[PDB]
Amino acid sequence: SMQEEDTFRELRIFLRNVTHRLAIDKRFRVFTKPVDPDEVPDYVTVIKQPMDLSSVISKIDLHKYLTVKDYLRDIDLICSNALEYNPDRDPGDRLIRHRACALRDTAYAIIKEELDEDFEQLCEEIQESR
Numbered sequence: 001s002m003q004e005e006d007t008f009r010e011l012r013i014f015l016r017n018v019t020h021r022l023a024i025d026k027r028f029r030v031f032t033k034p035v036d037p038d039e040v041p042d043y044v045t046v047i048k049q050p051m052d053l054s055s056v057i058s059k060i061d062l063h064k065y066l067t068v069k070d071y072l073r074d075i076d077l078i079c080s081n082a083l084e085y086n087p088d089r090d091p092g093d094r095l096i097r098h099r100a101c102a103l104r105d106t107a108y109a110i111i112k113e114e115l116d117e118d119f120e121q122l123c124e125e126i127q128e129s130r
């Protein structure tokens, strides 16, 4: 219905706002663009499912997120990718890992504080009916 399309539009508006707030945070600059396949060639080999904040914005606009859970799966993917590609004790690796986990914790905290539980529940119930 049109009520349901209004629900999803509200979700997209909310997701764009959260994603913008993540993308302007200086700590998260490394997660804002895809990994250049020239700049580092072993990435697309180790990371089978790359994900970044600009790709998150594209998926929002393509209506690929019908629930905040769908969105948080891709946030989780940005983080776990970073942990897996950077597993070493070197300080470069530890810094990215620290930032990846901060990205994840920040997104979950914003959603927990600002997304109404019933709004998300509605999104899920519309999703299950399709």
Ligand SMILES: CC(=O)c1nc(NC(=O)C2(N)CCC2)sc1-c1cncc(N)c1
Residues within 6 Å of the ligand: 029, 030, 031, 032, 033, 034, 035, 036, 039, 040, 081, 082, 085, 086, 092, 093, 096
């Ligand atoms: C996204 C990611 O996981 C990522 N990880 C990197 N890791 C490192 O450079 C090391 N510490 C381990 C190799 C040294 S670079 C990088 C990245 C690569 N191209 C572009 C952008 N925006 C980030």
